[PDB]
């Protein structure tokens, strides 16, 4: 009766465990207003305010968050909630409403459901990081 998915930015992992429930959204035991980078709350509120809470009617949504930084974790929770609702309606409800909510999310912003293609990369020898290198002198 349950779906188990995830969301992944740079280091932030957001584990989503959803099933038939009551509209319950716990993020390791706290709501979606109690995350201190709070302006980004609206980004954190984008799965609800775009789709309406009536579509989050009877679903238990557990969120357990690992790693990353705060902004990366917020986009991971946004990621995981959107993929969790879409995966729930695909596995347990039709293809049509899942496809419709996919088209609502992507045409708003693709980053809601797809991953980010880039990370803080490794280093090839010769500088501080990968791209910029050390500095020298003349004369």
């Amino acid at each position: 009766q349950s779906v188990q998915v995830f969301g992944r930015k740079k280091t932030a992992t957001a584990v989503a465990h959803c099933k038939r429930g009551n509209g319950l959204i716990k993020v390791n035991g706290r709501p979606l207003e109690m995350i201190e980078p709070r302006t980004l709350q609206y980004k954190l509120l984008e799965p609800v305010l775009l789709l309406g809470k009536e579509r989050f009617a009877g679903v238990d949504i557990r969120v357990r968050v690992k790693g990353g930084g705060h902004v990366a974790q917020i986009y991971a929770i946004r990621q995981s909630i959107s993929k969790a609702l879409v995966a729930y309606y695909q596995k347990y409800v039709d293809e049509a409403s899942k496809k419709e909510i996919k088209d609502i999310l992507i045409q708003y912003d693709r980053t809601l459901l797809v991953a980010d293609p880039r990370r803080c990369e490794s280093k090839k020898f010769g500088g501080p990081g990968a791209r910029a290198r050390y500095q020298k002198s003349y004369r």
Binding site: F6, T13, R62, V65, K66
Partner: peptide, 19 residues
């Protein structure tokens, strides 16, 4: 159930790290 969920999350994290 909670424990299971936690475990799953951990696993996911590990996978991500590996990737």
């Amino acid at each position: 159930a909670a424990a299971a969920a936690a475990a799953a999350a951990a696993a996911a994290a590990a996978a991500a790290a590996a990737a």
